[PDB]
Amino acid sequence: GSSGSSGEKAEDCWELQISPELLAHGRQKILDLLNEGSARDLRSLQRIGPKKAQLIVGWRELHGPFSQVEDLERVEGITGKQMESFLKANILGLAAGQ
């Protein structure tokens, strides 16, 4: 978690700080939602909009279910980054908002 301690040194990686069980626990939650949840529902997620949602849905509709959140990267418009920054918001947010 980011605090107000002298440093503010950017973190190239976050998953490295988050526990190993938190990563799986979080990602999963996001995945299931991306499968059962619909565009609108997705919009609720942090770092998500009406565009991306339609992009993640309009894909599965044909391709089908996603074997893993990472799949997002493949989705047009959404790259490994955009999807990476998002996963964090929720993931890290799950604990933050305890």
Q: Where are the domains of the chain?
A: 18-98
Distance CA 85, CA 98 (A): 20
Name the architecture of domain 18-98.
Answer: Orthogonal Bundle (1.10)
Torsional sign, CA 76, 41, 82, 20: negative
Q: Could you give the C-alpha distances from 8 to 1, 16, 88, in angstroms and in order?
A: 11, 17, 18
Greatest C-alpha distance within the chain:
49
H-only helix segments in 1-98: 20-36, 39-44, 50-63, 80-96
